[PDB]
Amino acid sequence: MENFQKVEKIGEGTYGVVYKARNKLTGEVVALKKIPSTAIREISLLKELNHPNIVKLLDVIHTENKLYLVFEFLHQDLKKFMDASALTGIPLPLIKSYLFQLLQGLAFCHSHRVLHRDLKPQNLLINTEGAIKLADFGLARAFEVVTLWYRAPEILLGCKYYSTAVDIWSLGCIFAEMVTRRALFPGDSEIDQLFRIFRTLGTPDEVVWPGVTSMPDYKPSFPKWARQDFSKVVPPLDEDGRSLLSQMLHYDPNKRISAKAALAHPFFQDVTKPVPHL
Numbered sequence: 328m329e330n331f332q333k334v335e336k337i338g339e340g341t342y343g344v345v346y347k348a349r350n351k352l353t354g355e356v357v358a359l360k361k362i363p364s365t366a367i368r369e370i371s372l373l374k375e376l377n378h379p380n381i382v383k384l385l386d387v388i389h390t391e392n393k394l395y396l397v398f399e400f401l402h403q404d405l406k407k408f409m410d411a412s413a414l415t416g417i418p419l420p421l422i423k424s425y426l427f428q429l430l431q432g433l434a435f436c437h438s439h440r441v442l443h444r445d446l447k448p449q450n451l452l453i454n455t456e457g458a459i460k461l462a463d464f465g466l467a468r469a470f471e472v473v474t475l476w477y478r479a480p481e482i483l484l485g486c487k488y489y490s491t492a493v494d495i496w497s498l499g500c501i502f503a504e505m506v507t508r509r510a511l512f513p514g515d516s517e518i519d520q521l522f523r524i525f526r527t528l529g530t531p532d533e534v535v536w537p538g539v540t541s542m543p544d545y546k547p548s549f550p551k552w553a554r555q556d557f558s559k560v561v562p563p564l565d566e567d568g569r570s571l572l573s574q575m576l577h578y579d580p581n582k583r584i585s586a587k588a589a590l591a592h593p594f595f596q597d598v599t600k601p602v603p604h605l
Protein backbone atom coordinates (compact mmCIF):
# COMPACT_ATOMS: atom_id res chain seq x y z
CA MET A 328 0.00 0.00 0.00
CA GLU A 329 2.94 2.46 0.14
CA ASN A 330 2.51 2.60 -3.69
CA PHE A 331 -0.95 4.37 -3.27
CA GLN A 332 -1.79 7.94 -2.13
CA LYS A 333 -5.39 8.40 -0.88
CA VAL A 334 -7.23 11.33 -2.50
CA GLU A 335 -10.77 11.14 -1.02
CA LYS A 336 -13.44 8.83 0.44
CA ILE A 337 -15.88 7.79 -2.35
CA GLY A 338 -18.08 5.41 -0.39
CA GLU A 339 -18.85 3.48 2.77
CA GLY A 340 -19.08 0.22 0.89
CA THR A 341 -20.66 -3.05 2.05
CA TYR A 342 -17.36 -4.76 3.07
CA GLY A 343 -15.34 -1.60 3.81
CA VAL A 344 -14.47 1.96 2.84
CA VAL A 345 -13.80 2.88 -0.84
CA TYR A 346 -11.25 5.65 -1.57
CA LYS A 347 -10.18 7.47 -4.71
CA ALA A 348 -6.34 6.92 -4.80
CA ARG A 349 -3.28 7.49 -7.02
CA ASN A 350 -0.84 4.66 -7.93
CA LYS A 351 2.71 6.04 -7.67
CA LEU A 352 4.29 3.46 -10.06
CA THR A 353 1.96 4.00 -13.07
CA GLY A 354 0.40 7.42 -12.21
CA GLU A 355 -3.02 5.72 -12.41
CA VAL A 356 -6.11 7.03 -10.51
CA VAL A 357 -7.98 4.06 -8.98
CA ALA A 358 -10.70 3.12 -6.47
CA LEU A 359 -9.21 1.35 -3.47
CA LYS A 360 -11.43 -0.79 -1.23
CA LYS A 361 -10.08 -1.85 2.14
CA ILE A 362 -11.84 -5.13 3.21
CA PRO A 363 -9.29 -16.42 4.56
CA SER A 364 -7.87 -18.51 1.67
CA THR A 365 -11.32 -19.30 0.16
CA ALA A 366 -11.76 -15.49 -0.34
CA ILE A 367 -8.29 -14.96 -1.91
CA ARG A 368 -9.03 -17.65 -4.52
CA GLU A 369 -12.58 -16.48 -5.39
CA ILE A 370 -11.41 -12.87 -5.60
CA SER A 371 -8.45 -13.91 -7.77
CA LEU A 372 -10.94 -15.56 -10.20
CA LEU A 373 -12.76 -12.15 -10.51
CA LYS A 374 -9.56 -10.56 -11.92
CA GLU A 375 -10.14 -12.67 -15.07
CA LEU A 376 -13.83 -11.73 -15.42
CA ASN A 377 -13.20 -8.76 -17.77
CA HIS A 378 -15.92 -7.03 -19.81
CA PRO A 379 -16.53 -3.42 -20.90
CA ASN A 380 -19.60 -3.17 -18.64
CA ILE A 381 -17.82 -4.56 -15.52
CA VAL A 382 -15.64 -2.27 -13.41
CA LYS A 383 -12.17 -3.71 -13.81
CA LEU A 384 -10.56 -5.42 -10.78
CA LEU A 385 -6.93 -4.33 -11.27
CA ASP A 386 -5.29 -6.04 -8.30
CA VAL A 387 -5.78 -7.84 -5.04
CA ILE A 388 -3.29 -6.98 -2.28
CA HIS A 389 -3.25 -9.25 0.81
CA THR A 390 -0.91 -7.64 3.42
CA GLU A 391 -0.78 -7.58 7.30
CA ASN A 392 -4.10 -9.56 7.56
CA LYS A 393 -5.90 -6.79 5.50
CA LEU A 394 -7.22 -7.19 1.97
CA TYR A 395 -7.19 -4.30 -0.51
CA LEU A 396 -9.00 -4.43 -3.85
CA VAL A 397 -7.77 -1.97 -6.50
CA PHE A 398 -10.42 -1.12 -9.09
CA GLU A 399 -10.79 1.01 -12.16
CA PHE A 400 -12.16 4.46 -11.15
CA LEU A 401 -15.35 6.07 -12.54
CA HIS A 402 -16.51 9.52 -11.51
CA GLN A 403 -20.19 9.07 -10.75
CA ASP A 404 -22.69 6.41 -9.66
CA LEU A 405 -26.27 5.99 -10.94
CA LYS A 406 -27.72 7.05 -7.56
CA LYS A 407 -26.09 10.48 -7.93
CA PHE A 408 -27.17 10.75 -11.58
CA MET A 409 -30.79 9.77 -10.73
CA ASP A 410 -30.84 12.36 -7.92
CA ALA A 411 -29.41 15.04 -10.31
CA SER A 412 -32.04 14.10 -12.99
CA ALA A 413 -35.04 14.00 -10.52
CA LEU A 414 -36.79 17.17 -11.78
CA THR A 415 -36.46 16.35 -15.50
CA GLY A 416 -36.08 12.55 -15.54
CA ILE A 417 -33.38 10.58 -17.34
CA PRO A 418 -34.30 10.58 -21.08
CA LEU A 419 -35.81 7.27 -22.24
CA PRO A 420 -33.06 6.66 -24.87
CA LEU A 421 -30.42 6.88 -22.10
CA ILE A 422 -32.44 4.62 -19.74
CA LYS A 423 -32.67 2.11 -22.58
CA SER A 424 -28.95 2.36 -23.37
CA TYR A 425 -28.05 1.83 -19.69
CA LEU A 426 -30.41 -1.14 -19.30
CA PHE A 427 -29.02 -2.72 -22.51
CA GLN A 428 -25.40 -2.31 -21.39
CA LEU A 429 -26.15 -3.71 -17.90
CA LEU A 430 -27.88 -6.74 -19.47
CA GLN A 431 -24.75 -7.28 -21.62
CA GLY A 432 -22.60 -7.24 -18.47
CA LEU A 433 -24.94 -9.62 -16.71
CA ALA A 434 -25.15 -11.98 -19.72
CA PHE A 435 -21.35 -12.16 -19.63
CA CYS A 436 -21.00 -12.82 -15.90
CA HIS A 437 -23.92 -15.26 -15.82
CA SER A 438 -22.34 -17.20 -18.76
CA HIS A 439 -19.31 -17.71 -16.47
CA ARG A 440 -21.64 -18.77 -13.56
CA VAL A 441 -20.80 -15.61 -11.56
CA LEU A 442 -23.62 -13.70 -9.81
CA HIS A 443 -23.52 -10.14 -8.49
CA ARG A 444 -26.19 -10.68 -5.73
CA ASP A 445 -26.33 -7.05 -4.64
CA LEU A 446 -27.13 -4.83 -7.60
CA LYS A 447 -28.27 -1.35 -6.62
CA PRO A 448 -27.78 2.18 -8.07
CA GLN A 449 -24.73 2.77 -5.79
CA ASN A 450 -22.83 -0.04 -7.58
CA LEU A 451 -23.64 1.06 -11.10
CA LEU A 452 -20.98 3.53 -12.30
CA ILE A 453 -21.19 5.85 -15.26
CA ASN A 454 -18.74 7.81 -17.43
CA THR A 455 -18.89 10.82 -19.76
CA GLU A 456 -18.91 8.56 -22.88
CA GLY A 457 -22.31 7.04 -22.14
CA ALA A 458 -21.03 3.80 -20.57
CA ILE A 459 -22.47 2.20 -17.42
CA LYS A 460 -20.63 -0.55 -15.50
CA LEU A 461 -21.36 -3.08 -12.79
CA ALA A 462 -19.22 -2.59 -9.66
CA ASP A 463 -18.37 -5.04 -6.81
CA PHE A 464 -19.24 -8.04 -9.07
CA GLY A 465 -18.75 -11.42 -7.31
CA LEU A 466 -17.70 -9.97 -3.88
CA ALA A 467 -20.89 -11.32 -2.20
CA ARG A 468 -19.86 -14.98 -2.85
CA ALA A 469 -16.29 -14.13 -1.80
CA PHE A 470 -17.27 -12.48 1.53
CA GLU A 471 -24.94 1.54 7.72
CA VAL A 472 -27.97 -0.67 6.96
CA VAL A 473 -27.65 -2.74 3.74
CA THR A 474 -30.53 -1.84 1.45
CA LEU A 475 -33.19 -4.44 0.77
CA TRP A 476 -34.96 -2.51 -2.01
CA TYR A 477 -33.55 -4.58 -4.86
CA ARG A 478 -33.59 -8.02 -3.20
CA ALA A 479 -35.32 -10.83 -5.07
CA PRO A 480 -38.31 -12.50 -3.39
CA GLU A 481 -36.64 -15.94 -3.33
CA ILE A 482 -33.87 -14.47 -1.15
CA LEU A 483 -36.41 -12.85 1.19
CA LEU A 484 -38.30 -16.20 1.37
CA GLY A 485 -35.16 -18.10 2.45
CA CYS A 486 -33.83 -19.79 -0.68
CA LYS A 487 -30.11 -20.30 0.12
CA TYR A 488 -29.35 -21.79 -3.40
CA TYR A 489 -30.63 -18.95 -5.57
CA SER A 490 -29.71 -18.36 -9.19
CA THR A 491 -28.62 -15.74 -11.70
CA ALA A 492 -32.31 -14.67 -11.77
CA VAL A 493 -31.69 -12.65 -8.57
CA ASP A 494 -29.66 -10.10 -10.59
CA ILE A 495 -32.39 -9.80 -13.23
CA TRP A 496 -34.90 -8.97 -10.46
CA SER A 497 -32.60 -6.26 -9.04
CA LEU A 498 -32.03 -4.79 -12.50
CA GLY A 499 -35.81 -4.73 -13.16
CA CYS A 500 -36.29 -2.76 -9.92
CA ILE A 501 -33.59 -0.31 -11.07
CA PHE A 502 -35.17 0.04 -14.53
CA ALA A 503 -38.53 0.90 -12.93
CA GLU A 504 -36.82 3.49 -10.70
CA MET A 505 -35.07 5.20 -13.64
CA VAL A 506 -38.44 5.51 -15.43
CA THR A 507 -40.58 6.70 -12.52
CA ARG A 508 -38.01 8.61 -10.46
CA ARG A 509 -38.98 6.72 -7.33
CA ALA A 510 -37.84 3.39 -5.91
CA LEU A 511 -40.20 0.53 -6.82
CA PHE A 512 -40.12 -1.34 -3.46
CA PRO A 513 -38.45 0.78 -0.71
CA GLY A 514 -38.75 -1.65 2.19
CA ASP A 515 -37.18 -0.89 5.56
CA SER A 516 -37.31 -4.44 6.96
CA GLU A 517 -37.46 -7.88 5.38
CA ILE A 518 -41.22 -8.21 5.95
CA ASP A 519 -41.89 -4.65 4.77
CA GLN A 520 -39.88 -5.44 1.62
CA LEU A 521 -41.76 -8.66 0.99
CA PHE A 522 -45.18 -7.11 1.60
CA ARG A 523 -44.40 -4.12 -0.65
CA ILE A 524 -43.61 -6.64 -3.42
CA PHE A 525 -46.84 -8.53 -2.71
CA ARG A 526 -48.99 -5.35 -2.72
CA THR A 527 -47.82 -4.53 -6.24
CA LEU A 528 -47.33 -7.94 -7.87
CA GLY A 529 -49.90 -9.90 -5.86
CA THR A 530 -49.23 -12.35 -3.02
CA PRO A 531 -47.55 -15.33 -4.73
CA ASP A 532 -49.19 -18.73 -4.69
CA GLU A 533 -48.65 -22.18 -6.16
CA VAL A 534 -50.32 -21.15 -9.42
CA VAL A 535 -47.78 -18.43 -10.33
CA TRP A 536 -44.81 -19.87 -8.39
CA PRO A 537 -44.86 -23.68 -7.90
CA GLY A 538 -43.06 -24.55 -4.66
CA VAL A 539 -43.45 -21.05 -3.09
CA THR A 540 -45.59 -22.31 -0.19
CA SER A 541 -42.84 -24.74 0.89
CA MET A 542 -40.07 -22.10 1.04
CA PRO A 543 -38.32 -21.65 4.40
CA ASP A 544 -39.73 -18.25 5.37
CA TYR A 545 -43.08 -18.63 3.61
CA LYS A 546 -46.04 -18.28 6.02
CA PRO A 547 -49.62 -19.31 5.13
CA SER A 548 -50.73 -16.31 7.26
CA PHE A 549 -49.26 -13.79 4.69
CA PRO A 550 -52.05 -11.43 3.59
CA LYS A 551 -53.47 -12.09 0.10
CA TRP A 552 -53.17 -8.94 -2.06
CA ALA A 553 -54.34 -8.73 -5.67
CA ARG A 554 -51.83 -7.89 -8.42
CA GLN A 555 -51.75 -4.31 -9.91
CA ASP A 556 -51.43 -3.50 -13.68
CA PHE A 557 -48.00 -2.38 -14.82
CA SER A 558 -49.64 0.55 -16.57
CA LYS A 559 -50.29 1.88 -13.00
CA VAL A 560 -46.81 0.95 -11.68
CA VAL A 561 -44.47 2.43 -14.37
CA PRO A 562 -46.26 5.16 -16.38
CA PRO A 563 -45.29 6.43 -19.06
CA LEU A 564 -43.30 3.37 -20.04
CA ASP A 565 -44.44 1.94 -23.40
CA GLU A 566 -45.78 -1.58 -23.94
CA ASP A 567 -42.40 -2.97 -24.98
CA GLY A 568 -40.80 -1.63 -21.80
CA ARG A 569 -43.70 -2.84 -19.60
CA SER A 570 -43.55 -6.34 -21.20
CA LEU A 571 -39.80 -6.58 -20.57
CA LEU A 572 -40.14 -5.29 -17.02
CA SER A 573 -42.93 -7.80 -16.27
CA GLN A 574 -40.65 -10.63 -17.44
CA MET A 575 -37.77 -9.36 -15.27
CA LEU A 576 -40.16 -9.30 -12.25
CA HIS A 577 -41.69 -12.79 -12.59
CA TYR A 578 -41.96 -14.43 -9.18
CA ASP A 579 -40.72 -17.85 -10.25
CA PRO A 580 -36.95 -17.53 -10.87
CA ASN A 581 -37.31 -20.20 -13.56
CA LYS A 582 -39.88 -18.10 -15.51
CA ARG A 583 -37.91 -14.83 -15.05
CA ILE A 584 -36.20 -13.71 -18.30
CA SER A 585 -32.47 -14.34 -18.66
CA ALA A 586 -30.08 -11.49 -19.51
CA LYS A 587 -29.31 -13.10 -22.89
CA ALA A 588 -33.02 -13.41 -23.81
CA ALA A 589 -33.70 -9.83 -22.55
CA LEU A 590 -31.11 -8.49 -25.03
CA ALA A 591 -33.28 -9.84 -27.89
CA HIS A 592 -36.41 -8.14 -26.58
CA PRO A 593 -38.20 -5.74 -28.97
CA PHE A 594 -37.69 -2.89 -26.43
CA PHE A 595 -34.07 -2.75 -27.73
CA GLN A 596 -34.89 -2.61 -31.48
CA ASP A 597 -34.13 1.15 -31.46
CA VAL A 598 -31.41 1.20 -28.83
CA THR A 599 -28.67 3.86 -29.15
CA LYS A 600 -25.80 5.14 -27.01
CA PRO A 601 -26.47 8.75 -25.99
CA VAL A 602 -24.01 10.99 -24.10
CA PRO A 603 -25.33 11.86 -20.56
CA HIS A 604 -25.51 15.40 -19.20
CA LEU A 605 -23.03 15.16 -16.26
Ligand SMILES: CN(C)CCNS(=O)(=O)c1ccc(N/C=C2\C(=O)Nc3ccccc32)cc1
Binds near residue numbers: 336357382398463
Ligand atom coordinates in the same frame (compact mmCIF):
# COMPACT_ATOMS: atom_id res chain seq x y z
C1 LIG B 1 -16.80 11.89 -2.61
N1 LIG B 1 -18.21 11.41 -2.73
C2 LIG B 1 -19.15 12.55 -2.57
C3 LIG B 1 -18.44 10.67 -4.01
C4 LIG B 1 -19.72 9.87 -4.03
N2 LIG B 1 -20.67 10.25 -5.08
S1 LIG B 1 -20.34 10.13 -6.66
O1 LIG B 1 -19.65 11.32 -7.04
O2 LIG B 1 -21.57 9.79 -7.32
C5 LIG B 1 -19.26 8.77 -6.88
C6 LIG B 1 -17.99 8.98 -7.41
C7 LIG B 1 -17.18 7.89 -7.66
C8 LIG B 1 -17.59 6.61 -7.32
N3 LIG B 1 -16.75 5.51 -7.55
C9 LIG B 1 -16.92 4.28 -7.07
C10 LIG B 1 -16.16 3.20 -7.45
C11 LIG B 1 -15.14 3.27 -8.55
O3 LIG B 1 -14.79 4.30 -9.14
N4 LIG B 1 -14.71 2.00 -8.74
C12 LIG B 1 -15.34 1.11 -7.83
C13 LIG B 1 -15.20 -0.27 -7.72
C14 LIG B 1 -15.89 -0.92 -6.71
C15 LIG B 1 -16.72 -0.21 -5.84
C16 LIG B 1 -16.91 1.16 -6.00
C17 LIG B 1 -16.21 1.84 -7.00
C18 LIG B 1 -18.87 6.42 -6.80
C19 LIG B 1 -19.70 7.50 -6.58
